[PDB]
Design a protein around this ligand. Structure first.
Ligand code: BBP
Ligand code: MG
Length: 456
């Protein structure tokens, strides 16, 4: 019938914020279940709308100027359509390298802005997602033998894709370079740690993860997470205390390697304050069951593994005993999580849309742009009419009437304040001095100046 496939992908963007910065380029290729390429590379650009200037640092990294994306790209509506078409092919595992924390948020935001369901793509038609970054971290932590693990310039293990490829003799340039490097990482771990690879892949599924969670017993688990830090191989033992009171997919864990005294001694208001500035640190963290967290039974990390990572196993066991004897900590941590921006681009997580609103937004999607002004349609959620105006003005500006044109002009004036444009110019001048010896970067910075001069 339909074959299971992987769709490896990567974005280049114009900045670090997945909602407020705009995408520049999307790259993807599909493989079979054994990581052999199927079909052709998909690479395309996104034209940025005229209400945005790129972050100069992002352009220095990607080498993609706003002029290039504008001249070679389609509008974000069309960009979104192409990506949505790829991501909704049945039985696809959509994956990348740091996609769970970055690329997937870019995707959610692109879909949100352009009237696609931000979530359905990842689970409908037997689809799933995965991320090779925490696979590499898990391999280093749990089963490192066979792979060369590079250090960064601070002397800690690095999981930068370019460091891992070089360290392991993998060729890594080409818009497809990061995608091909990600495929190489997948092959590396599958070949060299086959049982761990299979375990991690199987446990991408929320139900397999949920089966590991035993809140009444505070059953300990090994967890590998970038939040723990490279200095301990991104690893600790954790115990589940309670599920999040609002977020259906988040469990509240305690880091057993931490100091649990604040949890025993302080009240939830105090605990909440410390947790959100980031004097002992509050050893609580959320694990999101749909974000392919790395979790395994506690004995997966053996004493000799803990020793290698510098983790104090007996301290963790001691803390687990104390927590089990203090079940009032559960209500405390729940109370912590029981508990600003007027830019609709920043409002993806203000709430889920109702079925009625989703049905209305589908009509918007399936209507010709020229016919949108006459569309007799109503929305409940207050984000949607704002999303719709921006959608039309950014993508289909020739369909705006005089009044709408004036509204868009005002929008642009509020973005391009004299203080914003001055700071932008100042940043460019600073970077040209910093990179004066790198003539290609100097050329990129000059391109950014020229674009700002035009778009203003
Ligand atoms: C002896 C062997 C197999 C390594 C085991 N280690 N182990 C556990 N190690 C830890 C380490 C930390 C914690 Cl919090 C719980 C456990 S349970 C077992 O239950 C059995
Ligand atoms: Mg990337």
């Amino acid at each position: 019938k339909q074959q299971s496939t992987f769709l490896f992908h990567d974005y280049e963007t114009f900045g670090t914020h997945p909602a407020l910065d705009r995408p520049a380029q999307f790259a993807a290729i599909r493989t079979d279940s054994e990581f052999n390429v199927i079909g052709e590379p998909e690479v395309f650009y996104c034209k940025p709308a005229d209400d945005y200037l790129p972050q100069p640092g992002a352009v220095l990294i990607t080498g993609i100027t706003p002029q290039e994306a504008r001249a070679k790209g389609e509008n974000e509506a069309a960009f979104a359509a192409r990506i949505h078409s790829l991501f909704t092919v049945p039985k696809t595992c959509i994956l990348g390298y740091n996609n769970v924390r970055f690329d997937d948020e870019v995707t959610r935001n692109i879909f949100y802005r352009n009237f696609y369901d931000p979530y359905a793509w990842s689970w409908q038609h037997d689809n799933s997602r995965w991320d090779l970054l925490d696979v590499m971290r898990a391999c280093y932590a749990l089963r490192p033998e066979g792979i060369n693990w590079p250090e960064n310039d601070d002397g800690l293990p690095s999981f930068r894709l370019e460091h891992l490829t070089k360290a392991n003799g993998i060729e890594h340039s080409d818009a497809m370079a990061d995608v091909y490097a990600t495929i190489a990482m997948a092959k590396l771990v599958k070949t060299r740690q086959p049982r761990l690879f299979d375990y991690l892949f199987t446990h991408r599924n929320k139900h397999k993860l949920m089966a590991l969670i035993d809140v009444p017993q505070m059953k300990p688990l090994v967890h590998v997470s970038g939040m723990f830090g490279a200095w301990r191989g991104n690893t600790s033992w954790v115990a589940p205390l309670a599920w999040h009171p609002e977020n259906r997919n988040a469990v509240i864990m305690v880091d057993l390697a931490g100091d649990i005294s604040p949890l025993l001694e302080l009240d939830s208001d105090t605990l909440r304050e410390r947790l959100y500035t980031a004097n002992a640190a509050v050893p609580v963290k959320l694990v999101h069951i749909n974000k392919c967290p790395v979790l395994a039974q506690a004995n997966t990390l053996r004493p000799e593994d803990a020793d290698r990572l510098g983790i104090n196993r007996q301290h963790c066991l001691d803390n687990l005993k104390i927590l089990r004897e203090n079940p009032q900590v559960r209500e405390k941590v729940v109370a912590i999580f029981a508990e600003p921006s007027d830019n609709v681009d920043a409002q993806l997580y203000n709430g889920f849309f109702s079925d009625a609103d989703r049905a209305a937004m589908k009509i918007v999607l399936e209507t010709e742009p020229r016919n949108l002004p006459a569309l007799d349609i109503t929305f409940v959620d207050k984000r949607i009419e704002k999303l719709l105006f921006n959608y039309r003005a950014r993508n289909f500006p020739g369909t705006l009437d005089y009044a709408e044109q004036q509204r868009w002009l005002e929008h642009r004036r509020q973005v391009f304040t004299p203080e914003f444009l001055q700071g932008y110019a100042d940043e460019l001048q600073m970077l040209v001095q910093q990179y004066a010896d790198d003539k290609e970067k100097v050329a990129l910075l000059k391109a950014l100046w020229q674009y700002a001069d035009e778009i203003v």
